[PDB]
Amino acid sequence: ILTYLPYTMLGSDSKIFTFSNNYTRLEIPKDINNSFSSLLREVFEFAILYKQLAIVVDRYKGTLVSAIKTAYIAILEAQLNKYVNDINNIFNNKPNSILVVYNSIFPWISILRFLYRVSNRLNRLDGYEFLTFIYSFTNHGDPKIRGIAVTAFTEVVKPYYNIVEHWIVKGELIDNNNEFFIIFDQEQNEFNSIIKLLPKKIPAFIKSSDKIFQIGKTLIFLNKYCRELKWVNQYNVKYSAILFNNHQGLASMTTNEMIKLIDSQYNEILTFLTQIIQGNNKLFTHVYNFKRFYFMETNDFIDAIMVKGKDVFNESSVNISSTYLRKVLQDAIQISSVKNFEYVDRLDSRVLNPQHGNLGWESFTIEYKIDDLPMSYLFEGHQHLQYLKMFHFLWKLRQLNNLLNWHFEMFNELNHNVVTKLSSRNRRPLAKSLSIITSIRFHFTQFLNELIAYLSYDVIEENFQQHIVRKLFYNKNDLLLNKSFMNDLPKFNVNLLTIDELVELHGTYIDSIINSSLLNTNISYIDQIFNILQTIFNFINTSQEFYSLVVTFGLLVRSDELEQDQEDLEFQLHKIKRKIYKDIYQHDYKRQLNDLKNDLNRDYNLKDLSKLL
Amino acid sequence: PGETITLQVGQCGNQVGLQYWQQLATEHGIQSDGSSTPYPKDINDLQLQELKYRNDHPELFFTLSDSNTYTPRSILIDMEPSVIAKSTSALPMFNPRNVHLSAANNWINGYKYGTEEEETLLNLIDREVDKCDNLSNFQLFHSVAGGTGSGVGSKMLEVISDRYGHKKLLNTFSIFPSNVVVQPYNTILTLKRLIDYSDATFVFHNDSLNRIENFLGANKLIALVSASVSNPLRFPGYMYSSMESIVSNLIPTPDLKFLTSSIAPLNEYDMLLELSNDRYKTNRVGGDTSYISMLNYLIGYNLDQREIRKGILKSQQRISFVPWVARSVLVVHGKKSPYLKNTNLEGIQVTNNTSMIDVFTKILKQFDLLIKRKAVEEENEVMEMFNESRESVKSIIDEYKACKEITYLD
Amino acid sequence: PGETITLQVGQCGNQVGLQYWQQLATEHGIQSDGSSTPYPKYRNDHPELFFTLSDSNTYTPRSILIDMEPSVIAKSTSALPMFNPRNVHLSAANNWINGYKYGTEEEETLLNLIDREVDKCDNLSNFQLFHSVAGGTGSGVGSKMLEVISDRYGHKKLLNTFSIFPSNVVVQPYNTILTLKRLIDYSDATFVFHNDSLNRIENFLGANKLIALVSASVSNPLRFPGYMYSSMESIVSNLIPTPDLKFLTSSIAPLNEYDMLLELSNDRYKTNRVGGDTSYISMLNYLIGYNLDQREIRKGILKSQQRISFVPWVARSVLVVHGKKSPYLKNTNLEGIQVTNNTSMIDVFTKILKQFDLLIKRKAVEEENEVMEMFNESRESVKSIIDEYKACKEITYLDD
Amino acid sequence: IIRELLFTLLGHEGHYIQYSNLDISLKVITKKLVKFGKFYSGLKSFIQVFDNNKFGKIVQKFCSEVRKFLSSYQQVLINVEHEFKFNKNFNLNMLDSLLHQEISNEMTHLYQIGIEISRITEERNLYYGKFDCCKGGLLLQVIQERMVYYKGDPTSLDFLTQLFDIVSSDYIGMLNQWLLEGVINDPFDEFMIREKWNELFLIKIDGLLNQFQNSTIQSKILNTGKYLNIFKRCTGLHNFESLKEKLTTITSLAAPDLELKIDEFYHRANKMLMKLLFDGYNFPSVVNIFQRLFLFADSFQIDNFIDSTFSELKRGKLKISVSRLQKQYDDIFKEKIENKVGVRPSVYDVLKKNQKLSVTSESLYKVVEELMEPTITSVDLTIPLPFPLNLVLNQQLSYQYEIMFKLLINIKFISKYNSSNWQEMNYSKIWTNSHFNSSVKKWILRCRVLHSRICSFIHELENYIVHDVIEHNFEEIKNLIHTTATNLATSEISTVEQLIQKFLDYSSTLLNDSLLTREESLRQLRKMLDFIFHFNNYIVQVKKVLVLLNHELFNEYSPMDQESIDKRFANLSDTFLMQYEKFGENLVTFLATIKQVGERENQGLLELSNRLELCFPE
């Protein structure tokens, strides 16, 4: 009978039409014959596809799911509510045979086959494999397939774009469903382990994919680290109003309206980011002042702490570094030219690692205290431990240079006050002896003064102009365009750039100094210099026992003898093995000319250094 | 970073020292009144262009007061009061208490006047030490012959040693006379005290001075070199912060303390090769003289790295070096003063060479030629000071003659 | 190329140099106040070869204005107030004898004057001399002026002259034979201009502008850059094949580029006296009136190859020089200046020999016996250049 | 007898005839009836397999059209069901005429077009054919096969042109977006133009129609979108829309308006690109700068470089350093300017700080030799020419435009040596003494005349090169640039494809007329310029031989007074006579080589042969 056919289309058991729970066919024999049931098979498939799909919306009717899939269930229920509306009027009018009901439902099998194939792919890996599955059908032929694909996509993208619009006008994240690509790593160390982009979670419908990353990240940096709670409130009240009041949401916006909005919003924040790093934070003024203290660009200050601190630095690390190093730092500021310039309160000093207790000359350092100054500015440890190691290497060179010129000032008065007035006959073995010690100082003060002159101008000063000054105030490679050709955004000479590029210009500027040519079959080049500096450290330490003997040599000739001739010959014997010991450390510096020149010629970078070091 | 006291003695050092202090005034912004000029911003740091706070260090040569006046720490001493009035009235910022007034045409009259008023000269120097917080360098400006600066200037360099223990660096900045009856034996008497109570000497020939610039023009040429060696001191850079760091990098032996200077007059590649020419040296050169040490100043600001390095490598082959000295040509990249114009580029080379053989033997050849031709108990002390000065200048002559041959290794 | 310095000697040279520098200032748009005019930096013309660049943007020409009398100097400074007041030098000279003594005692102060003009140029390439070959103040010190600059600089700096020969005082045959000796062994290039023939071209002020037209058109590719003839050394190297016949003449054209090359070769438009049968050695044509259609120039050169007389040992070539017009001046028409050296300079030299040999036969302390020696040495100095012109014309040149 | 065949045409059983008979009566009319309904399920089986995401997008729209016919098929089965139960009393006669009048006209054509796709599925200006899965190209071309096979039927072709209209409606939408805008949006490989500026737009010759086969129309559709991307890569402007509209052709891929609208989109893609090159990047300001740097329009810059580096250019490549020659070239040509952010350098001061003067080890007389089948010879220039000016003035142009620079700087160096040798052969002190013998004075006078004819050779060869060749051919290029530029400013030559051809023709004739194309022509140009250079350096070494032939000059400049003076003068006249007969040797063959190639190929080269043959015999 024909009236039992609408009873099966809604999934109800009659006296002869029976089925099972799931995944079974409507095997109904004995109606007329196989001639009537064979055509009845393909319309029986219309009924099993309704019941198998109705149990999917029933078991997931807004429950057991907290994701984007709860909006697709509202899509699945809307077409299912329109399906049962079509069975009612097609059976309201009286049908003659079961062929006329097959004709009106035949435009609906195209819609029903698509909803089942996407519902079968549920409770599988249901992250981005479902949102991209619907978008993979939005560009297709067969407009009944394309018609159901767009109406199932425009109302499933609204929960996804709700994460995007909060990422544009507010600068936060409301994500909980293993979704939108800006994830927060739990290791909150610096502003690099925090927000990062994964390229694999980039969808095929987001056209920008890189400006929305650099709009939400700088909004967090302009809200919590550099708070400024006046511009962000004006930014949130303006652009969220023009996104909601006239375009009713971001999903209603087309592709051209999104790129026009985001690009006009991407350069709006970077104008404000480059506003407060330069006009208020003074990034370049502090990077140049970072060089005056960590890279020894003002040698008058480093010479002052080595003169006004020659008593504290001789002791061990038992110094308090609260009233001792504060006293030495503040009086040396009055000595040198640091007492007049602006940022003198930012200058502080400390002792590094007092638990070692090696010496006081080694543990000292200088610190540029960048407190506030609302900028981090990604100047974390790996940007600072290599930035304090370079100071301590440059501290070893200025230390030896301040006890080699005092060695010149100490031996000239030793010659004058003593040696020129020694009996008029013992001067000739002594004036010959002291001319070797003053001359071996000259071989040492020329090796350091050209080693610093290579580091301070070829390595330090040339990389600062190339990496810091050129990338900030000069143009890139990078153009030529007469703008008069077609139809409150202040543009300035900073070459506007983001967070990930401000850390890289300063990160490479330190990386291109500490790792450039020689600062890292043989030992390393930095280890070869430390062996030569150890000899100069040992040459001056063995020169004071020479200086303390000659002042006693003058005391023997003033007041005068058989026992005196024994005592004089033992004292001149102290001078014989001493100048021989001075020849030992001379050939070790002559050994420096052998191994360094055999290593500098292997590189084109250090070929010029092979003739002036 | 101790300050530097300058001593101007003699008729030369007063007019040369006037050009030395007028050069330091315009370089540091201070005027003849003494008031300070606001410091211009250096172009090493630019601001957000829409489209007090000093980087130099003038305290080493000037003192500070409450009303921000800068007074130079110079001591003026002469016989005639006319030469002091032309120096004080030209630059009114000189301290009038440093002015001393007494003529002497001989070294004996100059050294005897240095003995009679020891107390008023030693007290005048010690008042300037009370002004500074740290003292590390004394400076002189005296004539080797001619005026009274040879006689009483020879005594003023001796009272530094007995009072302070000779721990202060003495730079003499001597001006040797041109090619006069008093001139031969005036030179040989002050040079014995010059090589005994000093630490460094920058020689300047007057007869070779007019060859460079082609008496007021001769005074401006000495002050250009004398203020150039203090350019990394006043304007702090990476190296050469103190005067002991420059000189000890230049003088290998305490008997070798004689330095020859040269002015370069463009780019900075030809500027390094122009300084190596023998015609620009203030000291006269004869044959090919081997160089011991050299320091090239580029005090006009040079943003020309990798171009200075090519000039240093080229100036190593064209200069013959002493065998026991390593071939190292050192150059300082001095910074331009922001008060002076940035258009000009200066260049100075101070160096130690063997060219002082011809200078000292020129005096010793004329020394014995006059004392044999022309020649109360005053003749005995004069004669023994001649023979003491004769054998003492020979000691640095044979030290230079033995310097060319490979020695000082036994 | 190289920068250019000129020397104006004598009363006649100062009047020519007044018109020569007013025409050079007109072509580059330089006003008569030392002020520059914007182009109608970014300049294609090069006035730096003749004028000095200063910090205050004033334009001063590189000229020396030596003269005996202060009358014409006030004419040049008032009409053209941009000359350097240190370069001009002042103190009557009617003969060569009293005029040569002015330059001998003042040689040091005048040699020091021109050393101020060498260091202002980066690379100097040539000298110039505007004077009169007959005259006391011009030929007197100017003969010493070209001698002191010949041995000091020593063959590396070229020395061109633009002299004016007498057309007709009775002392004028005395000095024209003396200075013609010094113009032969000490000058590199020499231009001949006749005061009588210049009046025929226009149909003393009218003849000055015609010399200023030729003396400024010869350096038109020197200042205004082009494809060729960028330097003066490449211009004179065509016209002078051997140094013993360096005397040069010129021609002025005043409408087609084919007809302009035919009107320049006529003997009517000449600055020098032309005899009956003259044979040319080398020719240079200056088409400075913006000739662009190079189809009529090709016919004018090919017509001038087999029409004009030629010297047998030299290669007959008619070099045409395309000159760009000055943008500051208006385009009037095509301008042509033909400079060449020919055999037509015998008739004026033997005319000077005729007035000299007739005067010695007529005879019109310690100063007499020396000037007869100087009259003798200057006679076979210019008689050897006559036999040089007579030898190159015939076949007797190409043998022993 | 009728109800069982009512279900058989629906692809189902009728219990007597066949699957999804032996009682054959006079029922002849049902012999063809069950054959018509047999392949009904062939359409329905075609839908379920070819509607997948693969097999291209153009078969999906066709899969919608056959399914629309499946509903129009079942629409007439209600009428025969109404014909069955009612009292018709007309059986076995009219059943054939009803179901084939409006169905069989479309049922037959829809099956042959579907069975051919399954047949070709079992088989599986530019390049990269080898199409896969017979998606878009093979389906669209067999439809046009179906129309021409049934010519002569008005009632059959009208359905095929409507089937080709709606099926190919999706293919026009990407073709209209390529020609108008330049978007190549195609998720599959379902287009002609495949984005992979030379090997990037392969045209996929496997799947074109018969209309898109002409070699002239393949470039009209390929360069329309390529020249639009250049306007889209430079100034930005994704999806221009230019405050305007366009006709936006819609009708079909079979119309007389197809060949007209493709050319209409081709003129708009060239009008907008040429407006970017001429007005935006200042292309007239580039061709006047290439004349000032390669062909010496203003030789004041290069003449100051040659005389300053005159001693460096005479020596070989081994006795000179590369850095000394390049550095002097920068101070005289370039100008160091600061790239402060805010200023905008034009095309004049960008190409002026871009050239490089390399002296790498080849020769001028072998670069031209390898093109076809001293340091002044190997000096050259190179300009990077940034985007998008590297597209029209390509590398084929600049290689034929740099060769002229090495030739123009070689003869300007010979003209510099001869102009300097004239200075020392005429007004020196060593060369011109006063009282030496007449046997030597005849040798000096014979050396000056030979050099005065050598110097006039290069001053005549240059007057043909720099004026008759370079300047004359540039007057027609410069004329058709400014009067192109006056027409472009009005609209918001007329083709970029002919602008490259017009400049390649300019550089070729400059290379052709300047004696650098033929074998015997280059063999004499190398021999002639080398002999002049071998005579120029011969002059400077006689200056030390003339000091021993005069006794007065050697006394001032310090084997004398023997027969060796006459011996070395005899050796001087021997090596001078060998160069005089050698000058006449190569010149009469150089005059013969221009007469050979000046009559058959180049009429402009004969003008030199008319001018130079009348000079030197005279």
Numbering used by the authors:
A (entry chain D): 150 to 627, 630 to 638, 647 to 679, 687 to 726, 733 to 785
B (entry chain B): 2 to 52, 71 to 121, 127 to 203, 209 to 243, 260 to 310, 319 to 428, 437 to 471
C (entry chain A): 2 to 41, 71 to 121, 127 to 203, 209 to 243, 260 to 310, 319 to 428, 437 to 472
D (entry chain C): 91 to 110, 132 to 235, 265 to 336, 354 to 530, 575 to 693, 737 to 802, 812 to 871
From the manuscript:
The γ-TuSC possesses a Y-like overall shape of 180 Å height and a width of 60-100 Å. The N-terminal GRIP1 domain mediates canonical interactions between the Spc subunits, while the C-terminal GRIP2 domain binds one copy of γ-tubulin.
We isolated recombinantly expressed C. albicans γ-TuSC from insect cells by affinity purification and anion-exchange chromatography and used cryo-EM single particle analysis to obtain a structure at near-atomic resolution. We thus divided the γ-TuSC into two individual segments, each comprising one Spc protein and one γ-tubulin molecule, and refined them separately. Visual inspection of overlap, cross-correlation between density segments, and root mean square deviation (R.M.S.D) of protein backbone atoms in the atomic models consistently indicate that both copies of γ-tubulin in our cryo-EM reconstruction adopt a ‘straight’ conformation, as typically observed for αβ-tubulin dimers in stable and ordered microtubules. Thus, γ-tubulins in the fungal γ-TuSC are in a conformation that can promote growth of ‘straight’ microtubule protofilaments without a conformational change. Our cryo-EM density of the C. albicans γ-TuSC indicates binding of GDP, rather than GTP, and it remains to be addressed whether a nucleotide exchange to GTP is required to promote microtubule nucleation activity as suggested by analysis of γ-tubulin mutants in S. cerevisiae. In C. albicans, the γ-tubulin arrangement strongly differs from MT symmetry, requiring γ-tubulin molecules to move 5 Å towards each other during activation.
